[PDB]
Write a protein that binds this DNA or RNA. Sequence first.
RNA 1: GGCCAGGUAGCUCAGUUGGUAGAGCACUGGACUGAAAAUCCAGGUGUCGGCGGUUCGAUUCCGCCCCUGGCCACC
Length: 367
Amino acid sequence: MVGQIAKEMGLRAYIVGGVVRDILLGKEVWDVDFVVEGNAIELAKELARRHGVNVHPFPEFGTAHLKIGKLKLEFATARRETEPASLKEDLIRRDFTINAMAISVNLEDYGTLIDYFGGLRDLKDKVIRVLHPVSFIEDPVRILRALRFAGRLNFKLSRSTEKLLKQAVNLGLLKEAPRGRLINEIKLALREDRFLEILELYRKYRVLEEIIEGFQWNEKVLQKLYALRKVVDWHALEFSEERIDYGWLYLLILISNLDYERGKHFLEEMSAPSWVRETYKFMKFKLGSLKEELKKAKENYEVYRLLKPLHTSVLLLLMLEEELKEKIKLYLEKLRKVKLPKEKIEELKKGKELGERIEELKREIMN
RNA sequence: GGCCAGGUAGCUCAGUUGGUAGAGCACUGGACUGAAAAUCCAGGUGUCGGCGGUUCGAUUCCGCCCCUGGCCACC
Ligand SMILES: Nc1ncnc2c1ncn2[C@@H]1O[C@H](COP(=O)(O)CP(=O)(O)OP(=O)(O)O)[C@@H](O)[C@H]1O
Ligand SMILES: [Mg+2]
């Protein structure tokens, strides 16, 4: 309907940015970004009115958001900076060529891909490339972004882009960038499935040393990250109904050697979930004694008592130990599964003494 | 969109090792009154947001959503 409305208003609208990329990569997304030559607000209002849905205008931003079905539509007026601006002037202000393309929703040329900067070629060559030499200097956050994309899509940085990125980091612009945008970019990164590869890129270009104060790389943490990858793969394979957010575990491994103060402060800035904070605080202190107790575990009910109250994350962190692995597994796919029939339970019931008795019966069954 | 609280009677508010729920003022009924109010006895004051899952058993553990407030990211 957008093409028709644009025709009636004598305008030109374009699907723009990441949405295009994802499409060419065969990935379908529910968030669609439009750039309009002319007033975007009125186009959005008319689209919303014709579909009979609510509209959310932002006149100062010159953008409007509306939702149709599961589609989230964002309409933005073309602008030459973050006189009317051409679509090209709006595309050239973006980060990377693969993000810089556009698909025309205008009726005459409809479907046509618009690529000024050679983003389709870079998409075909698996290349991450900035539009201009000052790109990373303009928005240091992009330093992370590039890596993320390279991590996600298994692309590589251009020679020029790699040089410029390294130069940007060397200028210390990572410290000059707003803390919020960087932290948010990292939050975006840990949601990736290829997040470990991104972390590798982080290590290579040494961006973590700038963002997290006191943080340094070593081999133990790295190997712990890969072992964590193995465990995460296995758990997300067999136990997949029980899945949680995995990237946070990697993050905990990274800051594991950091001071509790800096760790707590970073997890504070990251706005981490409660179970992340709890798992961190448990890892920093009680995890050691817990492991030493698991070493002293003989009967299965002791393992039960020591494990069952814990969260999934703590167990996954416990699986990092070779000797404890098969034990944790045995607890998972065997030990904690059991039940009792009617008459028996009825005899067991004849307060908290019922619970204690049930515990006695369970430890009687196990051992 | 991410996260943090908050969700407890009509309203304003506490409650952790899961094990049979509470206060201050409205609610009914009767004793009391010519009627009413007060007061006494008392007792509703509640699937402790909604829906699934784990558990013998979930306000509690977890997952998906609703509502409100605040930190933000809103290229
Ligand atoms: N720092 C930046 N500099 C220039 N453009 C940026 C940018 N950050 C985001 N964008 C632009 O905004 C558009 C997409 O917006 P976003 O949704 O915020 C990032 P994305 O590429 O779609 O991946 P994402 O959906 O996982 O966040 C892209 O055209 C992209 O070039
Ligand atoms: Mg997006």
